[PDB]
Amino acid sequence: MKWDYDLRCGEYTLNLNEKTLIMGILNVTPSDGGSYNEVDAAVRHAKEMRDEGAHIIDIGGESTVSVEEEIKRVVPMIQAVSKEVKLPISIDTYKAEVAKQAIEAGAHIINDIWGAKAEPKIAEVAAHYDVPIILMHNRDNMNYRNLMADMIADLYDSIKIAKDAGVRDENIILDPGIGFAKTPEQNLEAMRNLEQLNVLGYPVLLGTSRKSFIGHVLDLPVEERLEGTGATVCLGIEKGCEFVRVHDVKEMSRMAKMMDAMIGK
Amino acid sequence: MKWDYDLRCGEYTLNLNEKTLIMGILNVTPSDGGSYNEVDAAVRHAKEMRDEGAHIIDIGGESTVSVEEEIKRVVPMIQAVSKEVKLPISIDTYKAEVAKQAIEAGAHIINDIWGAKAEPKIAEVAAHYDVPIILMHNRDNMNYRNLMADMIADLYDSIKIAKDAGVRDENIILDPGIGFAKTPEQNLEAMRNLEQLNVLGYPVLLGTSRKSFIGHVLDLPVEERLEGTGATVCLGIEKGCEFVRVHDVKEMSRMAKMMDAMIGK
Ligand SMILES: C=C1CN=c2nc(N)[nH]c(=O)c2=N1
Numbered sequence: 448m449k450w451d452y453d454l455r456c457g458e459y460t461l462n463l464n465e466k467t468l469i470m471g472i473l474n475v476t477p478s479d480g481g482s483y484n485e486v487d488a489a490v491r492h493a494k495e496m497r498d499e500g501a502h503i504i505d506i507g508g509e510s511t512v513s514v515e516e517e518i519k520r521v522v523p524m525i526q527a528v529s530k531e532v533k534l535p536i537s538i539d540t541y542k543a544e545v546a547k548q549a550i551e552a553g554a555h556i557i558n559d560i561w562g563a564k565a566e567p568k569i570a571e572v573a574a575h576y577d578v579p580i581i582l583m584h585n586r587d588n589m590n591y592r593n594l595m596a597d598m599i600a601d602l603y604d605s606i607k608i609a610k611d612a613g614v615r616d617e618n619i620i621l622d623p624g625i626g627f628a629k630t631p632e633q634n635l636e637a638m639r640n641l642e643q644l645n646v647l648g649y650p651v652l653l654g655t656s657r658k659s660f661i662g663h664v665l666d667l668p669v670e671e672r673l674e675g676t677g678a679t680v681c682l683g684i685e686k687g688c689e690f691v692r693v694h695d696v697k698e699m700s701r702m703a704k705m706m707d708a709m710i711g712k
Numbered sequence: 713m714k715w716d717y718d719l720r721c722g723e724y725t726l727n728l729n730e731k732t733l734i735m736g737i738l739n740v741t742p743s744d745g746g747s748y749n750e751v752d753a754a755v756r757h758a759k760e761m762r763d764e765g766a767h768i769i770d771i772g773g774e775s776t777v778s779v780e781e782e783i784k785r786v787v788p789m790i791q792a793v794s795k796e797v798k799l800p801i802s803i804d805t806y807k808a809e810v811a812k813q814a815i816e817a818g819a820h821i822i823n824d825i826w827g828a829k830a831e832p833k834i835a836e837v838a839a840h841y842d843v844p845i846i847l848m849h850n851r852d853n854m855n856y857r858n859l860m861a862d863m864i865a866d867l868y869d870s871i872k873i874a875k876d877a878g879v880r881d882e883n884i885i886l887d888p889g890i891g892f893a894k895t896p897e898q899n900l901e902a903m904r905n906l907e908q909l910n911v912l913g914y915p916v917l918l919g920t921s922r923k924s925f926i927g928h929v930l931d932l933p934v935e936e937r938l939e940g941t942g943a944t945v946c947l948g949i950e951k952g953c954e955f956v957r958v959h960d961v962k963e964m965s966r967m968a969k970m971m972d973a974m975i976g977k
C-alpha cells in the first residue's frame with residue numbers, strides 16, 4: 448500500500464491502491480441554460496460512462512463567458528447527474544463562486560486548471576467545504592528555464608496557497624497539465640519524466656485525452672486519437688498515476704485494467 | 713544509439729534506433745495446399761498490413777502435421793508475398809527442413825518457437841544462410857524455481873546452440889515467449905520484469921497479440937482483446953523492446969509511434 452488513506456468524497460469513497468481510477472469527461476453541448484435536451488443528453492452520457500468503467504464524472508462549463516451564467520449552465524447539470532448516477536462528480540472551474548454553487552448543487556471534487564492561482568479564493572472554498580481539490584500546472588507564458596524543475600516549483604506554489612487556505616494534505620491531487628502552457632515537444636518531455644511529480648507525495652491525475660500533441664506526433668485529427676491516447680494513459684499509469692481523465696471511457700478502462708494487472712497494482 | 717549495427721535481411725535492412733518495428737501476423741487459413749483462394753487471401757492480407765504500418769510479415773503454418781506437407785502449404789505463400797509486397801518475411805517454424813525451404817522460397821528471418829531446442833539442426837541452417845533467427849523461450853514443463861532467472865538461463869542455452877552453430881551475435885533476437893509454458897500469473901510477471909532480458913545484449917521481440925492472459929485479466933474473448941493488447945505493447949516498448957508481433961497492425965502501429973515519441977526513441 449503506497450497510500451495509507453482513502454479519498455473521501457462525501458457519500459462515496461475512492462481507494463488509491465486497488466486500481467487506476469478513471470475520470471470520464473462530460474462535455475456540456477449548450478440554448479438559454481437548463482432546458483430538457485441539454486440536461487437529458489448530459490445525463491445519459493454520464494449513465495453511459497458509468498456503465499463502461501468510470502469512477503468519477505467531470506463536468507465542465509467552457510473548453511478550448513459570464514460568471515453569473517456559467518452557474519446557471521452548470522448547476523442544473525450537477526443536480527441531475529448526482530441524483531441519477533451514483534458516482535462522485537468533480538467540477539471543472541477555476542472561479543471561486545462557481546465551485547461553491549456546484550458543491551452545493553451536489554459536486555464532490557474541485558478541478559482547477561489554474562492551480563488556485565487564477566482565483567486564490569477558490570482554495571478557501573475547497574477548505575470550507577472539505578472537498579478534494581485538483582491543482583493543475585498552468586501559467587500564462589511558456590518560457591521555462593527547466594521544464595520539470597519549473598513544473599514542480601509552480602505546482603508547489605499551488606500547494607502553498609491550498610495549504611495556507613486550510614486544505615489538508617489528504618484532499619490534494621496534482622496534475623502535470625498536459626496541453627497547458629507547453630509546446631508539443633514540451634508535452635512529450637513531461638510525459639517522459641512524469642515519475643518526478645511523485646516526489647511531492649500526492650496523488651496525481653493525468654489528462655491527455657485526445658489532445659493535439661497526440662495529433663502532432665501521429666498526424667491525425669481528434670476523432671482518430673484513440674490509440675495515441677491509449678499510449679499516454681499506459682505510460683502514465685506505469686509512471687505512477689492514480690487517476691486518468693479520458694473521453695473514451697470503455698476503451699481506456701480496459702487499458703488501465705491491463706496495466707494494473709501488469710505493474711502489480 | 714543503443715545499437716551500433718542494423719539488422720541485415722538480404723535486400724531489406726532494418727534499423728533498431730529509429731522506431732519500434734511491427735511484425736504483422738499472417739494467419740494461414742487452409743484445401744490441398746497452394747490453390748488460388750488460399751494464396752490470394754494471404755497476399756491481400758499482407759498487402760493490407762504493409763499499408764497499415766508493418767515492417768515485417770510473419771508467415772506461420774500451424775498455430776494453437778506432416779513435415780513434407782507443411783512445406784507444400786507454406787512455400788507457395790512466401791513465393792507470392794515476397795514478389796508482391798516489398799518487405800522482409802519471417803518464417804514461423806521450429807523444423808530444420810521447413811526453414812531451409814522457406815529462405816530459398818524467399819523468407820528472410822527464422823522465427824523458432826522452441827529456441828533451437830526442438831531441432832538443434834535449425835540453428836545450422838540459420839548459420840548457413842546467414843539469416844537473423846528469433847529464439848523464443850519455451851520448455852515442456854512449467855516448474856520454475858525462479859521465473860525470470862530461469863527464463864534468462866533457458867534463453868542462454870538457446871544462444872549457446874545458436875552460437876556453436878555459427879550464428880553471429882548480430883543475427884540474434886530474443887523473445888520472452890509470452891503464452892508459452894507460463895501460467896496467466898507467470899505471463900503478468902514476465903511482462904513486469906521484461907527489462908531484465910536486456911542484460912543479455914540482444915534485440916528483443918515481444919509477442920502478446922490477442923493472447924489469453926489478456927482474456928484472463930479483462931475477462932474478454934479473443935475479438936475483444938485490442939485494448940489489453942495495446943497495454944502489453946506499450947509496457948513492452950517502455951521496457952526496451954525492439955519488435956512487437958501483432959495482428960491488429962493499424963492500431964498497434966499508432967501506439968508504437970506514440971510510445972516512441974514519448975520515451976525518446
Ligand atoms: C482539457 C482539459 C480541461 N481540464 C483539465 N483538467 C485537469 N485536471 N487535467 C487536464 O488535463 C485537463 N484538460
Ligand SMILES: C=C1CN=c2nc(N)[nH]c(=O)c2=N1
Pocket residue numbers: 804823824825846848887889890891917918919920957
Ligand atoms: C502465438 C505465437 C506464435 N509464434 C510466436 N513467435 C514469436 N517469436 N513470439 C511469440 O510470441 C509467438 N506467439
